[PDB]
Structures are given as structure tokens and as C-alpha cells.
Amino acid sequence: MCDRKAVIKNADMSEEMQQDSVECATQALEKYNIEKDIAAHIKKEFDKKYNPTWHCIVGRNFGSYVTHETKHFIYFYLGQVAILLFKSG
């Protein structure tokens, strides 16, 4: 599996949203090594924690300018893959 060490160097969100994203990433990485499923779980946690609508994008070599509401872009990096949970809603 993957020991999801949430290296949130720049988590442009509140502590509760960052903790929710970290817990979702940890559970998803424990369950499976699927990047899309991990991003989906982070998106579900963000939708639970910061209301509709929320989404999370995870990639290895990806570029996406996080454009959402403030305290709604949960960015915890499981190593280097930053699961940017920018809640666009």
C-alpha cells in the first residue's frame, strides 16, 4: 500500500479541512494505491467538511492553478503528489 505521510507544506485551507484531507488520504492510501480513488476520497472528505461543491485532483507531474474559495483548497502532499482539494463551489 502507501503510508500517506501528509506533507502539507502549503495547505491553503483551515486546520479542520487540512485534517480531513489528511485523514482521507491516509485511509485511501491504506486501502489501495489508486491515485484517482485517493483523489476521489479526498474530494468526498472535502465535500463533507466544507459543503458543496468540492473536488480533489491528484497527479505526479501535473499543473493546476488552485482557483476556488479561500480556506477550501486542501493541499496535503502524500510525499510529493499534492492532493489539491480545491473546493470549487
Which spans of this chain sit near other proteins (rule: CB under 8 A)? 5, 7-13, 35-37, 39-40, 43-44, 46-47, 52-53, 55, 58-70, 73-77, 79-82, 84, 86
At closest approach, how far in Å is the CB of 32 from other proteins? 9
User: Considering only 3-11, 12-20, 45-53, which stretch makes contact with its own copies by CB under 8 A?
Assistant: 45-53
Q: Which residue number, 9 or 63, has a Cβ lying nearer to its own copies?
A: 63
- Reduced to 3 states (helix: H, G, I; strand: E, B; else coil), residue 37 is helix
Breaks in the chain, named by the residue before each, with C–N above 2.5 Å?
none
- What angle is formed at CA 22 by the lines to CA 60 and CA 16, rounded to 5 degrees? 135
CB-based burial of residue 37 (10 Å sphere; 0-12 exposed, 13-18 middle, 19+ buried)?
A: middle
In the three-class reduction of DSSP (H, G, I as helix; E, B as strand; rest coil), residue 75 is classed as strand
Give min distance, CB of 84 to its own copies, in A.
8
Indicate which single residue of 5, 23, 59, 71 sits in contact with its own copies (rule: CB under 8 A).
Answer: 59
